[PDB]
Each structure stands twice: as structure tokens, then as C-alpha cells.
Amino acid sequence: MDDKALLVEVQLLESKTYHALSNLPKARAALTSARTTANAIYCPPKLQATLD
Amino acid sequence: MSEKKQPVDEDNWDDDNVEDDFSNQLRAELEKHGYKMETS
Amino acid sequence: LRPGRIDRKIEFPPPNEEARLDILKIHSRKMNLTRGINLRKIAELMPGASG
Amino acid sequence: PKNPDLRIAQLRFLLSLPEHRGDAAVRDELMAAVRDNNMAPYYEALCKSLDWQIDVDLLNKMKKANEDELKRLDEELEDAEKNLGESEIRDAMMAKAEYLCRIGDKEGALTAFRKTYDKTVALGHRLDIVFYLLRIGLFYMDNDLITRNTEKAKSLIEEGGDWDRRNRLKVYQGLYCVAIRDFKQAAELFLDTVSTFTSYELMDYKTFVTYTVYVSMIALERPDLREKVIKGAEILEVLHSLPAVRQYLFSLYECRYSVFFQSLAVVEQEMKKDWLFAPHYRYYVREMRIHAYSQLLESYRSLTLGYMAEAFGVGVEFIDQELSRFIAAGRLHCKIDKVNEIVETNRPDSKNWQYQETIKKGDLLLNRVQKLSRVINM
């Protein structure tokens, strides 16, 4: 899909759940992927803060 | 130079020594040992 | 460049899609590629690569 | 590839002492006979215990369906034999042989797989047959079949780039090591927790993890246990699912002796019930008890048996009897005392056992020269 803003939010949710399950490397990977998608697209303030 | 002379007179081993040690024992199967502690 | 001093002037072209696959296989020889990797598609994805 | 063949084998192993509840294992086993046309297993079960009776005439009708599969094998084989293309006959033969493998242990195995193996258009295809040969041997615990298959795949077939196959193969080699009492090699070869894929032999990645935690702690030192299992990223999610596995794995590292002893008892019942883990159930529990006893003793030179009772089970006598037997085995490296009721410590290897370590290697090393000199000396 071309709805990148939804994609960044879901990627962040995956990192949070991996951290909850204690799988740190996958959690870092979900965070890194979320950041790279977010960099190209415009970020609303809540998204940028949640990402940070 | 075969001696001969005396004929007149893991997969299935290694654990044999360990198995022999408690072959008579282990009737409790460990769970009973825990029950014995519970009674204690 | 005169032919008596230099008889041949061989030219090395940018690798063709088939050639890029061959170079990709040569440099992926030691890599543990997971099953389902498509080396052929990867050669197509980079056109006019420098090898 | 093959999907429920391992599960069927485990249920049969379960049906050795607890067959009182038929629905738990026999009812699924009856479904197993009616699925994949498993004619030889229902007959083997008939020999083992169940009469089967009316549920055997219907199975004989299924045997006629198996005969229809055999007729399909003949029809496919003859048409492929007529066909000019080579290996088409083998492709039909291997697929039908796989159906035969479900139908009968002997029928599927031996020549049916071997003839397809004899032709080798693709090394990868030949590897697939070896994997098929290895699983049936594992399911029926045919050590000789397993030894031949592992030797063939490792010696030549693994050569060539097959990363997916190498990871699948490691699980097979490790599972055999778990089946034999050589747990240490399996714990090393179960390092591929990251990429077990969803191997059919594993009931689930969750089962592979339960085996890897159980196998590793017996053969893993405390530095490795924290680095590989306690700090293991993938294992931690899987132990999140199982509370008992998490408590047992964590308690030894946390030095929670009381909780682990209770947890080990839960593990014993699971190990005896589990196929491929039942043969060494006794060795696993006692070896864990020896490792547990060594850990608390390492910290204190002097330990009151009352303190050991507080750490583990309440009864002093039960810790004392295990202590004496383990001390007798040479395990527990310590000297017990009575009336004083204090357990002391044994000499360090570096401190003075270094002399013993040189002598132990030396006695075999010297013995060799004595025999060797005579042969040339004459």
C-alpha cells in the first residue's frame, strides 16, 4: 500500500511487542525500518515523538 | 602367538555404571522423593 | 595505439544481464544464501552495473 | 514434506505403560491408520495390543485403496517408462514410494526409496531421498538406518551450496544425539535456534526450544548458559510461552534451588512420557542433581546440612543420602561429616591436582612407550 503513515505506526508497534517478548535484535530492526520509512514521509508530531 | 590355553577354564554401555548405581533404587522415580519432602 | 606496437585493443563492456548473474554467483559462492533467494532477479534489479 | 509421521511414532511410544486412556493416544492413532493408508502400522498395532476387529475389515477395504495406489504406481511407472524423458519414472516412483512409506515401514523403505536414490539426475534430489530415509529410521529408532543416512549426507551430498538443507540436517543430527545419551553434541548442534524453519520433525519451534533448554543446561557451563540461553534472544520469547520451562531454566542460573528441585520433578514426568527422551530420563535427572549439588557447594567450603535442607527439600536425611551416593560416585567433589553435620570441600585442580593431572595423562602416555619399545626391541 502507499499509506506509509500507517506503515510507520505498525512498524513501531512490532518493536514494542518484540521488546515485551525480550527479542531485542528484532525490536531494533523494527525500530530501524520504522525510522527509514518515516524519514522520507512527513511525520505528525505524535508519530515523531513516539518514534523518538 | 595366540595364547589359547584358557578356553577350557551410550548405545548400550557407559551409562551402565550409572544405571547400575540406582538400578535397585529410583523406585520413587523422583516424584515420590518430592512427596516424602512434603510429608517431612 | 598503432597496431604494430599494440596488435589487439580488447574492449571490456559493462556486464550484460547474463554476465551480472555470473559475477553475482562468483561473489555469492561463500555466502550462506537462504533458500528462496532469486539471484537472477537481483541481476535484473541493477542494470548497467560496473561488475 | 512428511507431516504427522513423527507424531504417530511418539503416540505409539506413549502407548507402553499408560494406554488406559484410549482417546488420548489410540483414538488419534486410529485416525492415523485411516490417514495416509497406514496399513502396516494398524497391523503392527494389532500385533502389539488392540484386536481392531471390525475396524480392520474397513482397513482391508483401505488396503484395496492402497492396492489402487499400487495400481496407480504401476500405471504411472509404465507410462513414464514408455516416456522418453529420464527421471520421470523416478519422480513417479519416489512419490509412490513416499505413499508406500506411509502405508508400510518396510514397503516404503529399502528398494522403493533406494531405486529412486540409485538414479541421481540432481544431487539435491538425492539429498531429499536421504532426508526421507533418515526420518523413518528416527521414527522407528533404527540406529543403523540413521547412521548410514547421516554418513551419506555429510560425506558428499552436503558438499555444494545448500544452506537450507544444512540447517535442516543439523536438526536431524542433533535429534539422534538427543535420542542417544550423547546430549553434549546435540546442545552444540541446537545452536541453530534462529533458523529451525518449521521442520516437520519438530512438533513446533516451541518443542525444539523445550529440548534445546533441557539438553543445553545438562551440558552447558554457567558462562555459556548465561551467554547462550539466559541471555538468548530467540529462546526468551519461547520460554515466555512456557512458565515451567522459564522457571526451571531461570532457577538454576538464579540459584533458586528450592524451585528448581520441584520443577525438575515436573520435567521428569515430561521426559519419561516423551519419546526419544525416555531412555535417558534417569541419567538426565541425576546428572542435573549432581550439577545442582556442585553449584551451591562451590561457594562455601563449610556447609551445614541444615542449610542445604533450607535451600532444597526440607528433609535433612534425603539430602544426606544423595550427598553420600554422589560423593561415592566421585561426583560432588567434597567430604561429608557426621555429628558436626558440616560438608567440607575438595582440593582444587590448579592447587595440587595439577600433579595428578600430569600423572593421569602420564600413566597412559608412559604405558604406551613400554609396550612400543618391546616390539622393535624384540
From Swiss-Prot, chain A:
Family label: Belongs to the proteasome subunit S9 family.
Modifications the protein undergoes after translation, according to the UniProt entry: Phosphorylated by AMPK.
Name the UniProt record assigns to this protein: 26S proteasome non-ATPase regulatory subunit 11
Gene name of this polypeptide: PSMD11
Function: Component of the 26S proteasome, a multiprotein complex involved in the ATP-dependent degradation of ubiquitinated proteins. This complex plays a key role in the maintenance of protein homeostasis by removing misfolded or damaged proteins, which could impair cellular functions, and by removing proteins whose functions are no longer required. Therefore, the proteasome participates in numerous cellular processes, including cell cycle progression, apoptosis, or DNA damage repair. In the complex, PSMD11 is required for proteasome assembly.
Expression by tissue: Highly expressed in embryonic stem cells (ESCs). Expression decreases as ESCs differentiate.
Induction: By FOXO4; expression in embryonic stem cells (ESCs) is mediated by FOXO4.
Protein's cellular compartments: Nucleus; Cytoplasm, Cytosol
Top-level taxon of origin: Eukaryota
Curated annotation (Swiss-Prot), chain B:
Described function: Component of the 26S proteasome, a multiprotein complex involved in the ATP-dependent degradation of ubiquitinated proteins. This complex plays a key role in the maintenance of protein homeostasis by removing misfolded or damaged proteins, which could impair cellular functions, and by removing proteins whose functions are no longer required. Therefore, the proteasome participates in numerous cellular processes, including cell cycle progression, apoptosis, or DNA damage repair.
Organism: Homo sapiens
Pfam families: DSS1_SEM1 (PF05160)
Keywords, ordered alphabetically: Nucleus, Proteasome
Domain of life: Eukaryota
Annotated tissue distribution: Expressed in limb bud, craniofacial primordia and skin.
Quaternary structure and partners: Component of the 19S proteasome regulatory particle complex. The 26S proteasome consists of a 20S core particle (CP) and two 19S regulatory subunits (RP). The regulatory particle is made of a lid composed of 9 subunits including SEM1, a base containing 6 ATPases and few additional components. Belongs to the TREX-2 complex (transcription and export complex 2), composed of at least ENY2, GANP, PCID2, SEM1, and either centrin CETN2 or CETN3. Component of the homologous recombination repair (HR) complex composed of ERCC5/XPG, BRCA2, PALB2, DSS1 and RAD51. Interacts with the C-terminal of BRCA2.
SMART domains the record matches: DSS1_SEM1 (SM01385)
UniProt-listed InterPro entries: DSS1_SEM1
Locations listed in the record: Nucleus
UniProtKB/Swiss-Prot annotation, chain C:
Protein name from the UniProt record: 26S proteasome regulatory subunit 8
Subunit structure: Component of the 19S proteasome regulatory particle complex. The 26S proteasome consists of a 20S core particle (CP) and two 19S regulatory subunits (RP). The regulatory particle is made of a lid composed of 9 subunits, a base containing 6 ATPases including PSMC5 and few additional components. Component of a complex with USP49 and RUVBL1. Interacts with PRPF19. Interacts with TRIM5. Interacts with NDC80. Interacts with PAAF1. Interacts, in vitro, with the thyroid hormone receptor (in a thyroid hormone T3-dependent manner) and with retinoid X receptor (RXR). Interacts with ERCC6.
Summary of the function given for this chain in its UniProt record: Component of the 26S proteasome, a multiprotein complex involved in the ATP-dependent degradation of ubiquitinated proteins. This complex plays a key role in the maintenance of protein homeostasis by removing misfolded or damaged proteins, which could impair cellular functions, and by removing proteins whose functions are no longer required. Therefore, the proteasome participates in numerous cellular processes, including cell cycle progression, apoptosis, or DNA damage repair.
Signal peptide feature range: none
Annotated organism of origin: Homo sapiens (Human)
Entry's family note: Belongs to the AAA ATPase family.
Compartments in which it is found: Cytoplasm; Nucleus
From Swiss-Prot, chain D:
Keyword RNA-binding: no
Endpoints of the signal sequence: none
Biological processes, Gene Ontology terms: proteasome-mediated ubiquitin-dependent protein catabolic process
Subunit architecture: Component of the 19S proteasome regulatory particle complex. The 26S proteasome consists of a 20S core particle (CP) and two 19S regulatory subunits (RP). The regulatory particle is made of a lid composed of 9 subunits including PSMD6, a base containing 6 ATPases and few additional components.
PCI domain mapped to chain residues: 182-350
Domain of life (superkingdom): Eukaryota
Gene that produces this protein: PSMD6
Keywords: Proteasome
UniProt GO cellular component terms: cytosol; extracellular region; ficolin-1-rich granule lumen; nucleoplasm; proteasome accessory complex; proteasome complex; proteasome regulatory particle; secretory granule lumen
SUPFAM superfamilies registered for this protein in UniProt: TPR-like (SSF48452), Winged helix' DNA-binding domain (SSF46785)
Disulfide bridge partners, by residue number: none
Annotated function: Component of the 26S proteasome, a multiprotein complex involved in the ATP-dependent degradation of ubiquitinated proteins. This complex plays a key role in the maintenance of protein homeostasis by removing misfolded or damaged proteins, which could impair cellular functions, and by removing proteins whose functions are no longer required. Therefore, the proteasome participates in numerous cellular processes, including cell cycle progression, apoptosis, or DNA damage repair.
Recorded family membership: Belongs to the proteasome subunit S10 family.
Protein name: 26S proteasome non-ATPase regulatory subunit 6
PROSITE patterns assigned to the protein according to its UniProt record, in alphabetical order: PCI (PS50250)
Keyword Iron-sulfur: no
Source organism: Homo sapiens (Human)
